Design a protein around this ligand. Sequence first.
Ligand code: HEM
Ligand SMILES: O=N[O-]
Length: 184
Amino acid sequence: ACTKNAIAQTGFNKDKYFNGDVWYVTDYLDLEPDDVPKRYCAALAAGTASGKLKEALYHYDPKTQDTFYDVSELQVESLGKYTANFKKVDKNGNVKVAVTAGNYYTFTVMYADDSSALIHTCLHKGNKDRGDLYAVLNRNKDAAAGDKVKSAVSAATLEFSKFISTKENNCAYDNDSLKSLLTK
Ligand code: HEM
Ligand SMILES: O=N[O-]
C-alpha cells in the first residue's frame, strides 16, 4: 500500500504544467521492492479540455514490448494534488477498458518549473497492492536531471542516488499520440 502524503509545490503553476505538452519520465523511485520492472519507460501529457484537467499516459516495457496508453480526467483535491480515474485506450483513443471505481491514481506535483518536475503517484488498480512511486520528469526526452529538480528531491528528504534512470533504456515515445489523446 501507499504510505506517503506528498506535499504539493508551494505556488504550483497549474496552467504551466497542464499546458498540453509532453513530460518524459527520466528517473523513478518505487518505495515497494519489486513493484515495477527495473527497466521501464513512461511519459505523459497533461492539459485541459473544455476546462477539465486531463492526463494521457504512455507506458513502454523495453524488454517485453508491453505497451499501453491511458486517458484520465483529474479531480482536484488541492492545488497540485489530484485524483485520476483512468481508462485504458489504444494510441488513437479507442477505449479498451472503461473507467471503473477503484481504478484510479493520485498524483501530486511536488516541484515543477519550465523544463522539469518531481511528482508522486499512488496507483490503485483492482486487487493490486502497489506502493508509492516518485518520478522525475523533463520536457526533453532522456535529459539529465538539473540542479533545481535534484535539489527538490533532496528537500523532499529523498536520496536521488536511489532513483532508477530510464534514460539508457531503448525506448521510443509517441509524443504525437499523447498530445492528441488529451481530448479523448
Ligand atoms: C518509470 C515510471 C513508471 C513505471 C516503471 C511504471 C510501471 C507500471 C507498471 C509495471 C504497470 C502495470 C502494473 C500491472 O497492471 O500489473 C503500470 C500501470 C499503470 N501506471 Fe505506471 N509506471 C510509471 C509511471 C507512471 C506514472 C507517472 C503514472 C501517472 C501519472 C502511472 C500510472 C499508471 C496507471 C494509471 C496504470 C494502470 C493503467 C491501466 O491498467 O490501464 N505510471 N505502471
Ligand atoms: O507504477 N505505475 O504507477
